[PDB]
């Protein structure tokens, strides 16, 4: 309906070619296209569509600001993307009669180029946890051979799916902890209600080895639902409602707690600044930098959009920059290449704004992304 400057350029270039081809005597021979090979600039946007029974995922070339493909999903699916770009997958839920009838939970794996499903694995007894989309409630092990998903009721548990053998393996009983952060083919961490982290080591058989770390935050400090986790760096970046940031180093195989840093300056906190949104934090591995969505807001408006992004050095906590986004932004993420792109998704505008992660300048945008787009996913191919 309304064209962005980027799609307007694409549209014109395409018309130019069609007109020239016609004049040169070329004929039209329709076929099915393959998407370009996965690269550092490919970005995935998921649309939970405000809890609708069916959803959509958009595959975007961040460099050109063009939709290169799409994927259909069920009710509140959890998307995962292999860091090496060899495949994409999601844990999904469908029903025999739209939103009622027999429920089927399943995992689908897709070819990154043809977008065709290469695997469809049914999950016994509908064990998926149906909740607003949290990237780390469904995760891939670093080797990309295993997918882990969370079950809330009737008891906390983590399902193990063998993507290699294309089969569901077993449910792992865990303590009252949430989220899944894999660090090895057979190990992952969770965050528990008591404020500690739980390390779970499992195998093909037997009860798992569970060990708790020390409590790293008090009862009154609230850790958001969308922490940033870099599997390749083993860095867990977890902001609190006030912008204080807890960083955990899991690269050794055991949790090492780094000094907490305030993402907001003394003056901003005094002026009512607080982080807010959906995917509020992003982490760039190579630059070792943290990006956080912030704005002036009341303490209980933590899920509303924000118009600013602050950047800080993760090692020192030094404020590097503060960008005025110029739009109501709900989620952010970044490409993991040399000169990163800063992705800013607006649920309200159903638009993905693409900025230069260094200057904060808006480069291009892609609109009409579903009904209520909320999640951005990128691959760390480096």
């Amino acid at each position: 309906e309304a064209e962005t400057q980027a799609q307007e350029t694409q549209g014109q270039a395409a018309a130019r070619a069609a007109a020239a081809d016609l004049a040169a005597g070329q004929d039209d021979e329709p076929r099915i296209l393959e998407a370009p090979a996965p690269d550092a600039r490919r970005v995935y946007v998921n649309d939970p569509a405000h809890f609708a029974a069916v959803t959509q995922q958009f595959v975007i070339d961040g460099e050109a600001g063009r939709v290169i493909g799409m994927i259909d999903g069920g009710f509140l699916p959890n998307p995962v993307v292999a860091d090496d770009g060899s495949f994409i997958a999601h844990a999904s839920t469908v029903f025999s009669r739209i939103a009622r009838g027999e429920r089927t939970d399943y995992v689908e794996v897709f070819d990154p180029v043809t977008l065709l499903p290469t695997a469809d694995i049914e999950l016994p007894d509908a064990p998926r946890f149906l909740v607003g989309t949290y990237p780390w409630m469904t995760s891939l092990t670093p080797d990309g051979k295993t997918l882990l998903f969370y079950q809330f009721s009737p008891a906390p548990a983590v399902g193990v799916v063998d993507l290699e053998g294309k089969a569901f393996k077993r449910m792992l009983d865990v303590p009252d902890c949430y989220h899944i952060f894999p660090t090895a083919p057979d190990t992952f961490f969770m965050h528990c209600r008591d404020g500690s982290l739980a390390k779970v080591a499992f195998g093909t058989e037997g009860t798992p080895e569970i060990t708790h770390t020390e409590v790293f935050h008090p009862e009154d400090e609230f850790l958001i639902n969308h922490p940033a986790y870099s599997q390749k760096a083993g860095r867990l970046v977890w902001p609190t409602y006030t912008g204080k940031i807890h960083q955990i180093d899991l690269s050794s195989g055991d949790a090492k707690f780094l000094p907490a840093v305030e993402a907001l300056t003394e003056a901003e906190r005094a002026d009512g600044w607080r982080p807010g949104g959906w995917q509020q934090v992003a982490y760039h591995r190579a630059l070792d930098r943290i990006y956080l969505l912030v704005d002036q807001r009341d303490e209980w408006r933590h899920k509303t959009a924000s118009r600013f992004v602050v950047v800080l050095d993760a090692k020192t906590g030094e404020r590097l920059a503060k960008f005025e986004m110029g739009h109501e932004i709900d989620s952010i993420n970044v490409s993991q290449d040399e000169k990163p792109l800063l992705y800013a998704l607006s649920t309200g505008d159903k638009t993905l704004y693409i900025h230069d992660a260094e200057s904060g300048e808006e480069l291009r945008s892609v609109n009409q992304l579903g009904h209520g787009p909320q999640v951005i996913t990128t691959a760390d191919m480096g």
Partner: protein
């Protein structure tokens, strides 16, 4: 099979028989975590706080199916009569961290 339901819906705590085996629910917990009772006894749960709670036994505990008790509001009760000897674990549906146990001897 291992327990009968005296009442399908929760009732006023005032109706709870005097001297009945009671498990109070308050401050996000079953106040008596490991209740021991004799076969035939009727256990009664009473929610003492505004926060709604219930008792939930997974499938294979009291029968082939699970028993998702009704949610109790403040001052509401729900009962279960155990017929078989054994240990029965349960939790609160929306609050999985709340756990209790009934030992029938």
């Amino acid at each position: 099979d291992k327990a009968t339901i005296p009442s399908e819906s929760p009732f006023a705590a005032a109706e709870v028989a005097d001297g009945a085996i009671v498990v109070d629910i308050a401050k996000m917990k079953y106040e008596t975590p490991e209740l021991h009772v004799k076969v035939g006894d009727t256990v009664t749960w009473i929610n003492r706080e505004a926060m709604p709670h219930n008792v939930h036994f997974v499938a294979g505990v009291l029968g082939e199916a699970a028993l998702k008790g009704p949610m109790m509001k403040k001052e509401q009760a729900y009962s279960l009569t155990f017929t078989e000897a054994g240990t029965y674990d349960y939790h609160c549906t929306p609050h999985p961290f709340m756990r209790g146990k009934v030992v029938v001897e």
